[PDB]
Short mmCIF file of C-alpha atoms in Angstrom, two decimals:
data_model
loop_
_atom_site.label_atom_id
_atom_site.label_comp_id
_atom_site.label_asym_id
_atom_site.label_seq_id
_atom_site.Cartn_x
_atom_site.Cartn_y
_atom_site.Cartn_z
CA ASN A 1 158.78 114.13 107.22
CA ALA A 2 160.58 114.99 109.77
CA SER A 3 163.16 112.30 109.40
CA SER A 4 163.78 112.62 105.74
CA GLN A 5 164.83 116.02 106.67
CA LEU A 6 167.06 115.46 109.63
CA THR A 7 168.87 112.80 107.19
CA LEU A 8 169.60 115.95 105.16
CA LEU A 9 170.55 117.98 107.85
CA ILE A 10 172.80 115.47 109.33
CA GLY A 11 174.07 114.33 106.05
CA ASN A 12 174.73 118.01 105.30
CA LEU A 13 176.46 118.79 108.16
CA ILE A 14 178.57 116.25 107.88
CA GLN A 15 179.50 116.88 104.62
CA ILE A 16 181.63 120.41 105.53
CA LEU A 17 182.29 119.14 109.30
CA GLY A 18 183.27 115.51 109.09
CA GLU A 19 181.89 112.96 110.56
CA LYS A 20 184.22 112.22 112.89
CA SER A 21 183.42 115.40 115.03
CA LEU A 22 179.77 114.60 114.89
CA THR A 23 179.67 110.82 115.58
CA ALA A 24 178.00 111.59 118.88
CA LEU A 25 174.83 113.45 117.18
CA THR A 26 175.05 111.05 114.56
CA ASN A 27 174.44 108.66 117.31
CA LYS A 28 171.87 110.45 119.14
CA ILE A 29 170.00 110.72 115.61
CA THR A 30 170.25 106.99 115.38
CA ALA A 31 168.54 106.49 118.36
CA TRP A 32 165.75 108.89 117.95
CA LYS A 33 164.89 107.01 114.81
CA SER A 34 164.60 104.47 116.28
CA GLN A 35 162.31 105.45 119.48
CA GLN A 36 160.11 107.45 116.51
CA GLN A 37 159.68 104.15 114.88
CA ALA A 38 158.58 101.94 117.98
CA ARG A 39 156.27 105.06 118.95
CA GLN A 40 154.22 104.91 115.68
CA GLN A 41 154.47 100.96 116.29
CA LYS A 42 152.95 101.21 119.63
CA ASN A 43 150.24 103.97 118.25
CA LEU A 44 148.96 101.83 115.34
CA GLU A 45 148.44 98.79 117.90
CA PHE A 46 146.67 101.07 120.75
CA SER A 47 144.81 102.68 118.01
CA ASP A 48 143.76 99.36 116.77
CA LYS A 49 142.48 97.96 120.23
CA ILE A 50 141.45 100.64 121.65
CA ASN A 51 138.71 100.72 118.62
CA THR A 52 138.41 96.80 119.40
CA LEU A 53 137.46 97.40 123.21
CA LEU A 54 135.30 100.40 122.48
CA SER A 55 133.39 97.97 119.56
CA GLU A 56 133.39 94.90 122.05
CA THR A 57 132.06 97.26 125.07
CA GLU A 58 128.99 98.36 123.12
CA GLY A 59 127.74 94.50 122.05
CA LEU A 60 127.85 93.92 125.81
CA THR A 61 126.55 96.75 126.77
CA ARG A 62 123.54 95.66 124.30
CA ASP A 63 123.60 92.63 125.50
CA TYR A 64 123.74 93.80 129.54
CA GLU A 65 120.51 96.20 128.39
CA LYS A 66 118.82 92.99 126.29
CA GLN A 67 119.06 90.38 129.33
CA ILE A 68 117.96 92.84 132.24
CA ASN A 69 114.85 93.25 130.34
CA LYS A 70 114.61 90.18 129.78
CA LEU A 71 115.18 89.55 133.93
CA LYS A 72 112.11 92.02 134.19
CA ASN A 73 110.14 89.86 132.13
CA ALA A 74 110.77 86.76 134.00
CA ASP A 75 110.06 88.36 137.71
CA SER A 76 106.55 89.66 135.92
CA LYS A 77 106.11 85.88 134.78
CA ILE A 78 106.58 84.72 138.19
CA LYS A 79 104.66 87.76 140.25
CA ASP A 80 101.62 86.45 137.98
CA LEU A 81 102.02 82.43 138.30
CA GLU A 82 102.22 83.11 142.09
CA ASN A 83 98.78 84.99 141.74
CA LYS A 84 97.25 82.55 140.17
CA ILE A 85 98.47 79.75 142.41
CA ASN A 86 97.36 82.02 145.48
CA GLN A 87 94.09 82.91 143.60
CA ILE A 88 93.51 79.14 143.22
CA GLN A 89 94.59 78.05 146.54
CA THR A 90 92.23 80.88 148.41
CA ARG A 91 89.49 79.33 146.00
CA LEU A 92 89.98 75.72 146.95
CA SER A 93 90.50 76.48 150.66
CA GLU A 94 86.64 77.51 150.62
CA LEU A 95 85.62 74.75 148.41
CA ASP A 96 83.01 72.25 149.78
CA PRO A 97 84.77 69.88 151.30
CA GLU A 98 83.78 67.54 148.76
CA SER A 99 83.23 68.80 146.08
CA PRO A 100 82.59 68.40 142.35
CA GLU A 101 85.44 70.91 141.13
CA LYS A 102 87.87 70.23 143.48
CA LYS A 103 89.54 67.77 142.00
CA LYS A 104 90.12 69.63 138.65
CA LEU A 105 91.32 72.91 140.99
CA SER A 106 93.51 70.60 142.40
CA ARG A 107 94.91 69.60 139.35
CA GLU A 108 95.46 73.18 137.79
CA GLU A 109 97.14 74.03 140.65
CA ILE A 110 99.53 71.51 140.22
CA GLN A 111 100.22 73.02 136.69
CA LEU A 112 101.00 76.25 137.91
CA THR A 113 103.14 75.08 140.26
CA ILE A 114 105.13 73.23 137.42
CA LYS A 115 105.02 76.20 135.55
CA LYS A 116 106.44 78.57 138.31
CA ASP A 117 108.98 76.34 139.15
CA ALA A 118 110.32 76.28 135.79
CA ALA A 119 110.32 79.95 135.24
CA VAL A 120 112.44 80.39 138.81
CA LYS A 121 114.89 78.04 137.05
CA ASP A 122 114.72 80.11 133.71
CA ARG A 123 114.69 83.39 135.66
CA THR A 124 117.96 82.57 137.50
CA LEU A 125 119.67 81.09 134.33
CA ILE A 126 118.85 84.94 132.99
CA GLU A 127 120.25 86.50 136.26
CA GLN A 128 123.40 84.42 135.63
CA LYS A 129 123.95 85.47 132.17
CA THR A 130 123.54 89.48 133.07
CA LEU A 131 126.11 88.92 135.80
CA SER A 132 128.34 87.14 133.61
CA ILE A 133 128.43 89.82 131.04
CA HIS A 134 128.74 92.70 133.40
CA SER A 135 131.81 90.39 134.06
CA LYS A 136 132.48 90.31 130.93
CA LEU A 137 132.43 94.71 130.75
CA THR A 138 134.46 94.25 133.67
CA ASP A 139 137.08 92.43 131.92
CA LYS A 140 136.87 94.99 129.27
CA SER A 141 137.99 97.77 131.73
CA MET A 142 140.93 95.12 132.82
CA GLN A 143 142.29 94.94 129.19
CA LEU A 144 141.87 98.90 128.73
CA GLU A 145 144.12 99.34 131.65
CA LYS A 146 146.18 96.53 130.90
CA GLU A 147 147.14 98.25 127.02
CA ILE A 148 147.40 101.61 129.01
CA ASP A 149 150.33 100.43 131.03
CA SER A 150 152.31 98.99 128.76
CA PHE A 151 151.85 101.71 126.01
#
């Protein structure tokens, strides 16, 4: 233990040489001790914080990936509801102007439309979360800089 050895050393020197002639060194040693203790405080604090930021970053990375996948499925559901609607819309155009089945297809198209509007909504929500998570990751990079700058 450097500190304890140092205490013994200056103690020993003072024994023979007297404290008056060594006051300056004695004072320097006090400063050193103090610095060492502050550096040990910072070291521990930084270590804990880095561990936290890291773990937090990993969690948010997983969240980001999970949401990105969710958002792809959402664009799918939509590209599929757009198909059913166009399909049906084409089918309705070519429909015998009456006809016995027009009434029903028209009701299916209002339904696919209601579903597609709700899926566009839900999509934007997911996209928002994605972007939000990305923002939180950016916050983690800011927090990291903060810690480094005050080390």
